[model samples]
Target: MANERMNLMNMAKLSIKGLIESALNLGRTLDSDYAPLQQFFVVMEHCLKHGLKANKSFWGPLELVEKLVPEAAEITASVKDLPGLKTPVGRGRAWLRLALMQKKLSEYMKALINKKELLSEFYEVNALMMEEEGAIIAGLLVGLNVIDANFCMKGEDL
Candidate 1:
C-alpha cells in the first residue's frame, strides 16, 4: 500500500512537470507563429466548451484549477463566450480569451510546482483520481499542457 501510494505520487509529479514543459514549449511557438497559434486556440475553445463532457474525469483538472487558482474554474466555464474564427474581428477576440485563460492556467501550474501546499493539493487530487477513475486520468495531464500552451503564447506574468 505504501509503495502504491508512492508510485501514484511520483506519477502526479511527472504529469505536472510535463504540463509545465508543454506550456514552455507553447510559449516558444507563440513567439514564432502567431497565425497557427491562433487557429489552435480556436480549436481549444471549441473542445473545452462544446466537446468536453461534464464527467468526473473532466472535473479532475478543474478541481486542481479551483484549488490552485481561485476563480479560474468560473472563467473556464465561459469558454463558449470566446469568439470563433468566423470573422477577423471575432478571431481576435477569441484569441484574447484563449491567451488569458492559458496564461492563468500556466501560472496556476507553476504555482503548483513552486508551493508545497499546492503540491499536497495535487497529490490528494491525483490520488483520488487514480483510485476512483483509474486510467482515465492519464490524458488529463496532457490536456493541461495543451490548454497551457494555447494560453501561454502571449506574454504574461507567471
Candidate 2:
C-alpha cells in the first residue's frame, strides 16, 4: 500500500509539472516578437485586470490575464489535491482535470486566432506545441491506464 501510494504521488507530481510547464510555455509564446504590437498591449491590459504579472513574451496580456491565471490556478489547485489510487480506476476524473487545462489553452489560442494578426510562422509554432503537448499527456495517461482507448475514463476498461 505504501508503494502504491508513492507511485500515485509521483504520477500526480509528474502530471502537474507537465501541465504547468506546458501552460507557461503557452503564455510565453503569446509574447512573440512577430505578433502585432496592439495585440500585445491588449494582452498586457488583460493580465493587469486579472492580477497576473504581465509577461514580456505575450502581447495581448489583458486577454490572457482575464482568463489564464485563474484557470491555471484552478488546475494547479486541483492537481495538488488530487486523490491517490492503487490503480488508475477513477471515473473520468483525471481526464476531466487535464481536459480543463487543455480547454484553457484552447481559449487563449482562439483569442489569438480571432485577432487574425499573428505571424504565420509564429502561429504554426504555437499550434504545433499545443498538439504535441496534448498528445504527449494523453499518451502518459494511456500508458498509466488512467484512460481507456475510447477515453471512457474507466479503470476497468483499461
Candidate 3:
C-alpha cells in the first residue's frame, strides 16, 4: 500500500503537470474531447480507487466534500440535481468534472486532504489521503486553476 501510494502520488504530479501545460498550449476551454484532461480524470479515479477514496465507488468521499467544507455544498448539490445520474460513482464523476470546470478543484482538494482527521475514517491511516503525498497532489491541482474547462454538466450523462 505504501508503494502504491507513492506510485499514485507521482502519477498525479505527472498528469497534473501535463494537464496544465497542455491546456495552456491549447489555449481554449476544455471539453470532453480533450485527451489530456480525460487522462487526468482517469488517473484521479485510479488513485481514488486504490485507497477507496471514492469511498471506491465515489459519492461517499465526494459527499463528504460538502460536509467537510460546507461552501462546497453548492457543487455537491448541483451534482445531486443533475439528471440521469443513477449511481454513486456517476455522481462522483460529475462532481469531479464540475469541480475542475469551476477551477476550484485545488481548493476543494486541499480542503479534503487537509482534513486528515475526518478522512481517517474513510482513508486508511497510511493511505494517500492521510499521507503528505496527498497534500502534494492537492497542491498540484492549483496549477489547473489557470486553465479553463467547459463541461456540459447538465445536458449529457457522464
Candidate 4:
C-alpha cells in the first residue's frame, strides 16, 4: 500500500519549510496572523491523526506509555508521582510530541514496528504511528529540537 505516505511527507516538507523561513523571519517574531503556522499545526495533527482506529487520547498515549518498556517505567513513575499528565488531547499531543522532541519517537517507532503485533490491537497498521514516515516526521524536527516549534506562544505583543 504505497499510498499517501509520500503525499503526507510532501506536506511535511512544505510546512517545515515555511515554519523555518517564517520562524527565522521578522526577527523570528511569529505573529498570530502567520497563516503558515496555522496550517503547520494542522499538518502536524494530520500526520499524527492518520488512521487512528477512530481515535481518542485516553486510549493511545496512556496505553502506549505502557507499551514502551523502560521508557514507560521511568516516565510513568514520573507521571504517577506528579499525579497529573491527566489532560486533554492537547496535552496528549504535547506529551507524545515531547517523546518525538527528545528523539525517543524515531527510535520508538522502530521498537514499535518489531512489536506491532501487540500495538495493532489499538492502532491500525496503516496508522502513521507505525510507519517510517512517522519516524521521518518525528526526526524532521530533531534539528530544531532545542528550539521549540511552540516558541511563538512565548513572546507576544498581544
Q: Pick the candidate with the highest TM-score.
A: 3
Q: Which ten residues in a row have the lowest lDDT in candidate 2?
A: 144-153
| lDDT by residue (tens digit), candidate 1, 1-158 | 34544454455454445545555676643332344444434433322222222322233344455566665655544443543334433433443344344555445434333443433432443333334222333333344434433333233466
Per residue, candidate 2 scores C-alpha lDDT tens digits across 24-57 of 5555322223223223223322221221122222
Looking at model 3, residue 126 earns an lDDT score of 78
What lDDT would each prediction earn against the true structure? 0.41, 0.33, 0.80, 0.56
TM-score of each: 0.29, 0.23, 0.90, 0.57
The order by descending TM-score is: 3, 4, 1, 2
**Candidate 4 lDDT (Cα, 0 to 1):** 0.56
Pick out the ten consecutive residues of candidate 4 with the lowest summed lDDT.
146-155
Better of 2 and 4 by lDDT: 4
Between prediction 3 and prediction 4, the one with superior lDDT is: 3
Candidates sorted on lDDT, descending = 3, 4, 1, 2
Please report the TM-score between candidate 1 and the true structure. 0.29
